[PDB]
């Protein structure tokens, strides 16, 4: 019939005579009850529990900035239209108030955004690597430092053309380098 809210349901929101707490409770109760069929009494009790947890984990008079940040995070998660199921769970009680108190921003996202987040993290971790200079592998030259024949090579026409090509051999097991001409 009408959008359920604090004014529509006739539920008082002034219980702790705190202006900030009163208005944040009114807003969260309105947004929770607007699209929920659950009875309003348990919704009000859950609101009281979550606001009590917010107050007890962080005093507003000393950490008003962090209080506002946490309220904004939770409120934005509630209004988020991409994942309506959460407003069921908080109505159903599946998500505990302490979990919402302690949880980070990422976990409250739906599954597809979660998966995109891990994919992005993996791609970034791959893209932060440097150029791997993999050299030609061969087993003919003998290294003088560790004597492991896994010595890479590179040969070119660099010396004067009066003389043949020049080769440089680098041991990939110890780091030795030498030249043959």
């Amino acid at each position: 019939t009408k959008p359920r809210n604090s004014k529509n349901d006739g539920v008082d929101t002034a219980i702790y005579h705190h202006k900030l707490r009163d208005q944040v409770l009114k807003a969260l109760y309105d947004v929770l009850a607007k699209e929920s069929e659950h009875p309003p009494q348990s919704i009000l009790h859950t609101a009281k529990a979550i606001e009590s947890e917010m107050n007890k984990v962080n005093n507003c008079d000393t950490n008003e900035a962090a209080y506002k940040a946490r309220y904004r995070i939770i409120y934005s998660n509630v209004i988020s239209k991409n994942n309506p199921d959460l407003k069921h769970k908080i109505a159903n009680g599946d998500i505990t108030p302490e979990f919402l108190a302690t949880c980070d921003a990422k976990d409250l996202a739906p599954a597809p955004l979660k998966q995109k987040i891990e994919e992005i993290a993996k791609q970034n971790l791959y893209n932060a690597q440097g150029a791997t200079i993999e050299r030609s592998v061969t087993d003919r030259f003998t290294c003088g430092k560790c004597k492991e024949k896994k010595v890479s090579y590179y040969q070119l026409q660099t010396r004067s053309a009066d003389e043949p090509l020049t080769t440089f051999c680098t041991c990939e097991a110890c780091g030795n380098r030498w030249k043959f001409s």
Partner: protein, 256 residues
């Protein structure tokens, strides 16, 4: 081509995660690098918009702004820095939207306020609206575009979200140290290091989470300025020996 090689702490050497945190904490990050569309748009009435995507973000902060913001509603510019921000670039530098986006930016000069969404929205949209007093002159107030294009350019170019200056790139690498094993012999042990592209040694040295006693650069003038003249001599010797011996030639130690 100046460069700088950073060796991490003994505890964080074998794990990639602390290494990537340090790499993010060193590289220079600026706003122009993190906006897929930092588009200058007309914002005549910031109260409502035609685009549905930003409409959802509208009511979030319009129910989440303080009384002072309600008073300052009229200060928001008739143009907008509408920031469609790339998710990948923002998450690469471990950059939280709210704290980094607004704390430092408003603290710097109290010049630009923002309506910003939580990272969960599919399109990360920030509304950067500069803040000016209403006491501005009539001729000044008429020339909205003239002030705001200039301040928008000075905004993109001259705001540093995180990092140290002059370091263009930082890159991860894996090296093979040789260490005495507990039984006494020498064994090969891998390690993670960070190689940059650009040198600023006075500030990289004090960043927590690295080894401040094994840092080195191929610019011996900086080492001379910071560490001393004997350190500069050792670095210069390493440079000369490297350039000579990279060709396989051998020259006795006394000459060099």
């Amino acid at each position: 081509t100046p460069s700088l090689t950073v060796y991490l702490e003994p505890g964080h050497a074998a794990d990639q995660e602390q290494a990537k945190l340090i790499r993010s904490a060193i590289e220079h990050t600026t706003l122009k690098s993190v906006t897929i569309a930092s588009e200058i748009y007309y914002d005549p009435d910031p109260r409502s918009t035609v685009i549905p995507e930003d409409e959802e973000i509208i009511q979030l902060h319009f129910s989440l702004l303080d009384e002072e913001a309600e008073q300052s509603f009229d200060q928001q510019s008739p143009w907008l820095l509408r920031l469609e921000l790339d998710r990948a670039a923002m998450n690469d530098k471990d950059l939280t939207m709210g704290q980094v986006g607004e704390r430092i930016k408003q603290t710097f000069k109290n010049d630009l306020f923002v309506i910003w969404s939580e990272d969960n929205d599919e399109k990360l949209i920030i509304r950067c609206r500069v803040v000016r007093p209403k006491s501005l002159d009539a001729e000044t107030e008429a020339e909205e575009d003239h002030m705001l294009k200039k301040i928008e350019n000075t905004m993109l170019e001259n705001i540093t979200l995180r990092g140290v200056e002059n370091i263009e790139r930082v890159v991860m690498m894996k090296y093979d140290r040789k260490v005495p094993s507990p039984t006494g012999e020498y064994v090969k042990e891998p390690e993670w290091v960070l190689e940059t592209d650009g040198v600023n040694l006075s500030e990289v040295m004090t960043v927590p989470g690295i080894d401040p006693t094994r840092i080195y650069t191929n610019s011996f003038i900086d080492i001379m300025e910071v560490l001393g003249i004997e350190a500069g001599r050792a670095a210069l010797y390493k440079e000369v020996y490297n350039v000579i011996a990279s060709d396989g030639s051998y020259v006795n130690y006394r000459h060099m």
